[PDB]
């Protein structure tokens, strides 16, 4: 058995940059026009597909965590990454990217510079209060 998902069916099919945002426990595609605009309250999964001369495709998975993102989002970006790697027969290299501490490689995917925006989608984790 493997992991299936509509977005997984689209991942790494050709050279390019694919960006998904974690939205209420799901992997949601980011509009291509909005690439590089990251909500500091959210978590994302980026897949970078490069064409190798040998005809094979190289893969780099980066999960980006905003300073104000909730636990369900940062936890889910990490799991989805593992699952996307597995779906790609574990051929991907995984990178953890933290806001303001991103790697030079990742920063290079964005020619006009990556941009941070306040806000993001709400968490779906139900807050649990300690007994009064």
């Amino acid at each position: 058995s493997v992991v299936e998902h509509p977005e997984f069916l689209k991942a790494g099919k050709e050279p390019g940059l694919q960006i998904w945002r974690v939205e209420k426990f799901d992997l949601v595609p980011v509009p291509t026009n909005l690439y590089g605009d990251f909500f500091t309250g959210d978590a994302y999964v980026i897949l970078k597909t490069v064409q190798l001369r040998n005809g094979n495709l190289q893969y780099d998975l980066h999960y980006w965590l905003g300073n104000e993102c909730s636990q369900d989002e940062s936890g889910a970006a990490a799991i989805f990454t593992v699952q996307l790697d597995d779906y790609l027969n574990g051929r991907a290299v995984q990178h953890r990217e933290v806001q303001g501490f991103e790697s030079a490689t990742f920063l290079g995917y964005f020619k006009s510079g990556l941009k941070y925006k306040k806000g993001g989608v709400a968490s779906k984790l139900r807050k649990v209060a300690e007994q009064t």
Partner: protein, 370 residues
């Protein structure tokens, strides 16, 4: 909408609740109490067992037993009781209505995983289930796919190095020194100060002092000397009976045992060494990642000062140029459960569950098939 349950069965505490919640709704002692004085004709209109706090309250008429030893299920008959109580008494759910995720210790024997699968399907009739490794869920809960987890509870300590989502089985370390052993030690060192505590009943009072007043010293020797000088480390504690006691160098001597097991007469190496040792059993090319992503998980990792000592302890053991980092999240007592609550909630997790249909077709062996 169908609601998944998450059950994290520990040597000391059961953490149970619903997928999508940020914390376990039910937290109680993993204990089963049975009548001390039994017989076919002994206690006719009386419960054949109790679980958790109920068992501890009626401790005077009961024989208390822990079905999980050092993170491993050891008493199947008593474990079903725990599970029953979890479903019916604590969660107030009908098991047959909810897909159920359970946790396991790393290196959990194959047959134990099968037994757990069988009981859930055959005795509880769950529509679906899944077993996950405790330490890995903690890593996921900290938003990492690579790091080394130090998981220390009431019965076991493990060092679990994980790379790109998977534990490295060959490099895992288990140490049978944890919370219960620390509670027992603080009992023994308080007797040196005069205080009388030996019974199972008193053990429960010392545990509360262990969780409220103890801490880890950055430098054990200096700490000892600083406690022999003034009395700036001394603290007061109000007994259930109203009496007040004064606690001293025991505050830091008790968790020191984690670093020097010789204190309890154990010949093993401390948790800093087992961490360094687990790391050194990994491929050199991943060590940097490990070293920089030390996640602390579990109750016994809650002592104040624990993260600074380990940070100190491991830089000493590792190459002089190694960037080292300890991550001790405030929620780490529940990290495992929280990891499970997130995993069971994911859109991509639906196909992951083992169905009753799949079990009937394949049997308990299905659990391994991932």
């Amino acid at each position: 909408e169908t609601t998944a349950l998450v059950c994290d069965n520990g040597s000391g505490l059961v953490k149970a609740g619903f997928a999508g919640d940020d914390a376990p709704r039910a937290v109680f002692p993993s204990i089963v109490g049975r009548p001390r004085h039994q017989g076919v004709m002994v206690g006719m209109g009386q419960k054949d067992s109790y679980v958790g706090d109920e068992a501890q309250s009626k401790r005077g008429i009961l024989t208390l037993k822990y079905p999980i030893e050092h993170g491993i299920i050891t008493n199947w008959d008593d474990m079903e009781k725990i599970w029953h109580h979890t479903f019916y008494n604590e969660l107030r759910v009908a098991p047959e209505e909810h897909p159920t995720l359970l946790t396991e210790a790393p290196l959990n024997p194959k047959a134990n995983r099968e037994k757990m699968t069988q009981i859930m399907f055959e005795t509880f009739n769950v529509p679906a289930m899944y077993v996950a490794i405790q330490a890995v869920l903690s890593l996921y809960a900290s938003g990492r796919t690579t790091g080394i987890v130090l998981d220390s509870g009431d019965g076991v300590t493990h060092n679990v190095p994980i790379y790109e989502g998977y534990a490295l089985p060959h490099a895992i370390m288990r140490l049978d020194l944890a919370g219960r052993d620390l509670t027992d030690y603080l009992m023994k060192i308080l007797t040196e100060r005069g205080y009388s505590f030996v019974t199972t009943a008193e053990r429960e009072i010392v545990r509360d002092i262990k969780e409220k007043l103890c801490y880890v010293a950055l430098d054990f020797e200096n700490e000892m000397a600083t406690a022999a000088s003034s009395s700036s480390l001394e603290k007061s504690y109000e007994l259930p009976d109203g009496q007040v006691i004064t606690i001293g160098n025991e505050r830091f001597r008790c968790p020191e045992t984690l670093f020097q097991p010789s204190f309890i007469g154990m010949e093993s190496a401390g948790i800093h060494e087992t961490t360094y040792n687990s790391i050194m059993k990994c491929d050199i090319d991943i060590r940097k990642d490990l070293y920089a992503n030390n996640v602390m998980s579990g109750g016994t990792t809650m002592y104040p000062g624990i993260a600074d000592r380990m940070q100190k302890e491991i830089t000493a053991l590792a190459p002089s140029t190694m960037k080292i980092k300890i991550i001790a999240p405030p929620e780490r007592k529940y990290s495992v459960w929280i990891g499970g609550s997130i995993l069971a909630s994911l859109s991509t997790f639906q196909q992951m569950w083992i169905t009753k249909q799949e079990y009937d077709e394949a049997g308990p062996s299905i659990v391994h098939r991932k």
